[PDB]
Amino acid sequence: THPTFENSPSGTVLTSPPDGSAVDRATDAARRVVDALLRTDRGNANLERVAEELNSIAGHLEEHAPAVAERLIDMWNGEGVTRHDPVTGPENALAPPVVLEGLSDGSVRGTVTLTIPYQGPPGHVHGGVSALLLDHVLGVANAWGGKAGMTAQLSTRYHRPTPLFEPLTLTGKLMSVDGRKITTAGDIRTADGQVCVSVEGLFVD
Amino acid sequence: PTFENSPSGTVLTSPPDGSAVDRATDAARRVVDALLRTDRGNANLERVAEELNSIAGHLEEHAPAVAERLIDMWNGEGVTRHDPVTGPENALAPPVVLEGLSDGSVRGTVTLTIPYQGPPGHVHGGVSALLLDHVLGVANAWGGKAGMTAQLSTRYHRPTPLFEPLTLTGKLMSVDGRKITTAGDIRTADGQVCVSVEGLFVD
């Protein structure tokens, strides 16, 4: 059922495709609000009414629950790539979101340009955000490699500053399997190819 | 502030206020959560997106000429206020509130919500890593040291649940030349370690 490097063409989009909704347009607008709040003038007296508006909007959203809830994909249990997660979730305003494709050699790849909510050192991506993105990519690389495992250990190494506001290439690949034990590796590079962050993860199942 | 010069219980981060940017951010956090639970078929989402865009336009148009200065915690400038773990005006942050303790450790308690979900009902492993990474930077600051991150080794012991109080703790463990070694963990209310970390930083 789930797409893997053996049953799907190279370039198969693994994350959720744009559908033109609706809720995705609203989530994009929320992401835009999140960005703007970090840049806005904090002395703006209008922020009082803006908070009322945002709270009003949230109240509306809360009062409109879906009649039939969509299932949550447990990717780490072999159910396919997740759609609700804080890295790639289209309806998750925490997610950039990252778009990922599976390639013929077993690797998974995407490019993301990150913005100020993701900031740690001035002008650069928080080292923890780099870890979050890489963790998720390894999960997707495992799905695409036809394997499933619970995260056991992540070892992240930081080589060069990771900048905001420019294209970062995320890549992951399942490297080996020994029984229940899966080893997966990935990195984040700038457009010139230089590695900023790399990771080795160990998984079980 | 460092455990040398400051009392146990010193709040280290900048927790949200009743004022006006913090209340707007808190309200944005509420929207973010609601979007993940709401009816995708609700026809009103058309107007909701228009309002959020209108709000964003307002916030964008009400911005200073020069952006506000940032605290570079990793370069010894103090604790960050802009980050996606503790920043009161960063709607990506839960936010986590951290305090410094006499023994040199830092600690905070957080209840995580559905935007942070990985496995169903549970915190994304990468979110645990993020939270821990920042906690280690703060622990270094409270210990009066600072270095850029070199390596973070994160071990997952037990599942980390959403919707309940989690304790985050970090402490600078040693300094050996340029190398700073820092450790921490996330524990449930019963004290059990869900996730632990060891970080190496280079001054």
Task: Please state, in angstroms and rounded to a whole number, the distance separating the CA atoms of residues A201 and A185.
Answer: 6
Looking at residue B12, what DSSP letter applies? -
Q: Hey, are the CB atoms on A61 and B37 less than 8 Å from each other?
A: yes
Kind and range of the H or E element at A199? strand A195-204
- The Cα-based distances of B76 to A150, B73, B128, B138 in angstroms read 36, 5, 24, 10
Q: Note whether B32 and B114 are same-domain residues.
A: no
| CATH code, domain with A50 | 1.20.58.350
Q: Note whether A109 and A197 are same-domain residues.
A: yes
Provide φ and ψ at B172, rounded to 5°: -65, 130
Q: Which of residues 61-90 of B touch A (CB under 8 A)?
A: 62-64, 67-68, 70, 72-75, 80, 82-85, 87, 89-90
Domain holding B34, by residue range, is 16-74
- Identify which of A44, A61, A62 has the shortest CB distance to residue B62: A44
Q: Note whether A155 and A107 are same-domain residues.
A: yes
Q: Quick check: B31 and A60 in contact, CB under 8 A?
A: no
Which residues, 6+ apart, have CB-to-CB distance to A96 below 8 Å? Answer: A87, A112, A114, A115, A118
Burial A137-170 (b: 16+ CB within 10 A, else e): bbbbbbbbbbbbbbbbebbbbbeeebbbeeebbb
Residue B29 token pair: 């956090």
Q: Quick check: B145 and B172 in contact, CB under 8 A?
A: yes
Q: Does A121 touch chain B (CB under 8 A)?
A: yes
Burial A32-57 (b: 16+ CB within 10 A, else e): bbbbbbbbbbeebeebeebbebbbeb
With contacts defined as CB-CB under 8 Å, which chain B residues touch A94? 32, 92, 115-116
Q: Note whether B171 and B114 are same-domain residues.
A: yes
Task: Report how many Cβ contacts below 8 Å link chain A to chain B.
Answer: 278
Task: Please state, in angstroms and rounded to a whole number, the distance separating the CA atoms of residues B13 and B96.
Answer: 8
Backbone conformation region of residue A11, classed left if phi is above 0, alpha if psi is from -120 to 50, else beta? left
Helix (H, G, I), strand (E, B), or coil: what is residue A101? strand
Q: Does A54 touch chain B (CB under 8 A)?
A: yes
Nearest to A84 by CA among A63, A70, A100, A64: A70
- Identify which of B40, B83, B149 has the shortest CB distance to residue A66: B40
Q: Say if residue A97 is preceded by a cis peptide, omega within 30 of 0.
A: yes
Helix (H, G, I), strand (E, B), or coil: what is residue B35? helix
Residue A109 token pair: 């790849």
Q: Note whether A196 and A157 are same-domain residues.
A: yes
Q: What is the Rg, in whole angstroms, of the alpha carbon atoms belonging to chain A? A: 19
| CATH code, domain with A198 | 3.10.129.10
Q: How many alpha carbons fall within 13 Å on the CB side of residue A82? A: 31
Q: Hey, are the CB atoms on A22 and B48 less than 8 Å from each other?
A: no
Q: Note whether A151 and A188 are same-domain residues.
A: yes
Q: Note whether B159 and B101 are same-domain residues.
A: yes
Which residues, 6+ apart, have CB-to-CB distance to A39 below 8 Å? Answer: A116, B59, B60, B63, B67
* Beta strand residue intervals within chain B, DSSP E: 10-11, 99-100, 106-111, 148-156, 165-176, 179-187, 193-202
Q: Note whether A98 and A198 are same-domain residues.
A: yes
Task: Please state, in angstroms and rounded to a whole number, the distance separating the CA atoms of residues A13 and A79.
Answer: 16
Among residues A76, A91, A106, which one ends one of the domains?
A76
Q: Note whether B186 and B128 are same-domain residues.
A: yes
Task: Report the Cα A35 to chain-centroid distance in Å.
Answer: 17
Task: Please state, in angstroms and rounded to a whole number, the distance separating the CA atoms of residues B194 and A68.
Answer: 33
Tell me whether strands B10-11 and B99-100 are parallel, antiparallel or unpaired.
antiparallel
Q: How many alpha carbons fall within 13 Å on the CB side of residue B72? A: 9
Q: Note whether B155 and B104 are same-domain residues.
A: yes
Task: Please state, in angstroms and rounded to a whole number, the distance separating the CA atoms of residues B119 and B105.
Answer: 30
Looking at residue A49, what DSSP letter applies? H
Q: Does B26 touch chain A (CB under 8 A)?
A: yes
Among residues A59, A76, A93, which one ends one of the domains?
A76
Helix (H, G, I), strand (E, B), or coil: what is residue B128? helix
Task: Please state, in angstroms and rounded to a whole number, the distance separating the CA atoms of residues A121 and B134.
Answer: 11
Q: How many alpha carbons fall within 13 Å on the CB side of residue A80? A: 12
Tell me whether strands A108-113 and A101-102 are parallel, antiparallel or unpaired.
antiparallel
Q: Quick check: A54 and B25 in contact, CB under 8 A?
A: no
Provide φ and ψ at A86, rounded to 5°: -75, 10
Helix (H, G, I), strand (E, B), or coil: what is residue B167? strand
Q: Note whether A12 and A111 are same-domain residues.
A: yes
- The Cα-based distances of B24 to A31, A43, A201, B33, B192 in angstroms read 14, 12, 38, 14, 35
Q: Does B24 touch chain A (CB under 8 A)?
A: yes
Q: Note whether A104 and A187 are same-domain residues.
A: yes
Q: How many domains does chain A divide into?
A: 2
Residue A181 token pair: 């034990």
Nearest to A86 by CA among B154, B194, B111, B126: B126
The resolution in angstroms reads: 1.9
Among residues A76, A94, A116, which one ends one of the domains?
A76
